[PDB]
Design an enzyme around this catalytic site. Sequence first.
Site, PDB file in Angstrom:
ATOM      1  N   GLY A 125       0.797  -1.201   0.000  1.00  0.00           N
ATOM      2  CA  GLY A 125       0.000   0.000   0.000  1.00  0.00           C
ATOM      3  C   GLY A 125       0.840   1.266   0.000  1.00  0.00           C
ATOM      4  N   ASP A 167      -6.701  13.511   5.074  1.00  0.00           N
ATOM      5  CA  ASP A 167      -6.633  12.836   3.786  1.00  0.00           C
ATOM      6  C   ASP A 167      -7.828  11.918   3.579  1.00  0.00           C
ATOM      7  OD1 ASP A 167      -5.614  12.085   1.359  1.00  0.00           O
ATOM      8  OD2 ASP A 167      -4.338  10.498   2.175  1.00  0.00           O
ATOM      9  N   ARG A 222     -10.054   5.950  -1.275  1.00  0.00           N
ATOM     10  CA  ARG A 222      -8.891   5.069  -1.271  1.00  0.00           C
ATOM     11  C   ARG A 222      -8.369   4.745   0.123  1.00  0.00           C
ATOM     12  NH1 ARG A 222      -7.600  10.136  -2.578  1.00  0.00           N
ATOM     13  NH2 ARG A 222      -6.253  11.164  -1.038  1.00  0.00           N
ATOM     14  N   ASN A 223      -8.813   5.466   1.151  1.00  0.00           N
ATOM     15  CA  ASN A 223      -8.403   5.233   2.532  1.00  0.00           C
ATOM     16  C   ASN A 223      -9.476   4.582   3.394  1.00  0.00           C
ATOM     17  OD1 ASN A 223      -5.810   6.267   2.042  1.00  0.00           O
ATOM     18  ND2 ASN A 223      -6.525   8.368   2.382  1.00  0.00           N
ATOM     19  N   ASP A 227      -6.343   4.950   7.960  1.00  0.00           N
ATOM     20  CA  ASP A 227      -5.204   5.791   7.590  1.00  0.00           C
ATOM     21  C   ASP A 227      -5.434   7.243   8.012  1.00  0.00           C
ATOM     22  OD1 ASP A 227      -3.361   3.954   6.539  1.00  0.00           O
ATOM     23  OD2 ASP A 227      -4.375   3.913   4.600  1.00  0.00           O
TER      24      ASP A 227
END
Length: 265
Positions: free
Chosen positions: A17, A127, A131-132, A145
Amino acid sequence: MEIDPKDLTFLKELGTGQFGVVKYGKWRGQYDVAIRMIREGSMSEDEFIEEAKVMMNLSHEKLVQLYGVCTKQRPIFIITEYMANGCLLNYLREMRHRFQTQQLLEMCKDVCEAMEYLESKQFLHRDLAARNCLVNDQGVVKVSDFGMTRYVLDDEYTSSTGSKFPVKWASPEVLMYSKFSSKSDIWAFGVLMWEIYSLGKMPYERFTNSETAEHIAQGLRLPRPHLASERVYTIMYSCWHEKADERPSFKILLSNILDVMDEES
Ligand SMILES: Nc1ncnc2c1c(-c1ccc(Oc3ccccc3)cc1)nn2[C@H]1CCCNC1
């Protein structure tokens, strides 16, 4: 708490990752877990280790649990709740024809709840993006994350103009002043909602980061997804106010979301 790797087993490779290799395994035999080996040279290790003790005490059903870490070796191990169905972006792409709008709104309730818990702890993600986020075996979405970008050494990932900066999720005050707040996480959540109802399409797919920054700066906003009702769109659009303080908190957002869920019966 610290974990003795003696009490861990490596069972499968899940891939590398953003922050290094990750493997599926078992902790103490009965706990399905995901072990991340922190890429060397990527993190401010001492600062990150000390902050890990803070991020361990964060608990919420919709937040990927941190069970512990192994720091008395390198690479640091991160032992986390195992999310069998992986990243929300890839779950969305593989199952495009499987989602009824009730499950999409559910995925938004999950994320909004996790971000409201982070709001109440005065802890920022910095963030937030599809995607997290990860999905477990029951299709439930959970955030992950969080706060990791506070400790990346690569300046492309951190600077406003870096080639790797998530411009497409950033609020105007993050692009222009690097003023991170829960309101910038709200803007990012708006973009995330758009990802969800778009089934994983790249926001501003055909815009360079610069082009995106400028269009946003002058009032451009993502189009209503085909699967998004005008009420859902109103919510993700309210996340995108130019004035950060003009954006509704995650609590007010969760309430609106639940109103929409009730009205979808
Ligand atoms: N937890 C997982 N469950 C299932 N799959 C997983 C993960 C991880 C993963 C591991 C550690 C990690 O660190 C954290 C940092 C801060 C907060 C929480 C966790 C974050 C994510 N990667 N992956 C797969 C995704 C697809 C590609 N291959 C890797």
